[PDB]
Amino acid sequence: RPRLNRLLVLEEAVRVADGAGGHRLDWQAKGEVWAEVTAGSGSERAGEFVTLASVPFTIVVRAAPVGAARRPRPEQRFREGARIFRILAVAERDREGHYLSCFAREEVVA
């Protein structure tokens, strides 16, 4: 069972809609979770005009019902200091349902 050791400031953006239909994100902070962060095989990835450096980072937190504040939705991102971990998906790692796998990137521009 996972050994949780990092403090990840979970962050959810409020979506202020603009006139054209596109929302504007704020990334106001949410309450902090505890998690383990297990790396994957990382390599740099061609962005737009940026040679973005990415690593897979399966993050494991504890669980909650889907209508609770403690669930990381894939809308949200983690942030440890200045290292933003995006959330690709959340997937309910444990069999009994105690732990959630998340999926991250840590795309540093490099």
Partner: protein
């Protein structure tokens, strides 16, 4: 893109979500940025224009060929036609108000309609020519 393109997508978004038809046929699911949640599945999307730079010595304008796609999770896409028919009924000869300059004619162009992926979702692009004057 050109200077009017900040105001053009804003005003064609406002003429949408005000038509009575496509409000009873799509709902509130007209957007550029997708509101995350359950993904309702019979939305439209209004983002990708391109400019054909029709300008002047004195002044300059633009030909925005913006694409409004219609995406539909229904089994057939006769549902997606009438939603796209309510797009085209709302926009050809619009004569709306912009924030930077004005447009002079919002015509109609090619509108392809196909299955995007696994043949589960159906995309109906609708290219509209927007000759705006800066």
């Amino acid at each position: 893109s050109y200077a009017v393109a900040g105001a053009l997508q804003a005003a064609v978004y406002q003429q949408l979500r005000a038509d009575a038809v496509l409000a009873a046929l799509v709902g509130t699911a007209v957007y550029d940025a997708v509101p995350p949640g359950p993904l309702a599945g019979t939305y439209v999307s209004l983002g990708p224009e391109d400019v054909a730079d029709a300008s002047d010595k004195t002044g300059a304008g633009a030909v925005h060929d913006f694409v409004i796609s219609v995406i539909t999770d229904a089994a057939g896409f006769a549902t997606a036609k009438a939603a796209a028919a309510a797009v085209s009924d709302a926009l050809v000869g619009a004569d709306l108000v912009l924030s930077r300059g004005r447009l002079v004619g919002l015509w109609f162009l090619r509108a392809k309609a196909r299955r995007v992926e696994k043949a589960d979702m159906r995309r109906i692009d609708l290219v509209f020519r927007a000759r705006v004057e800066g």
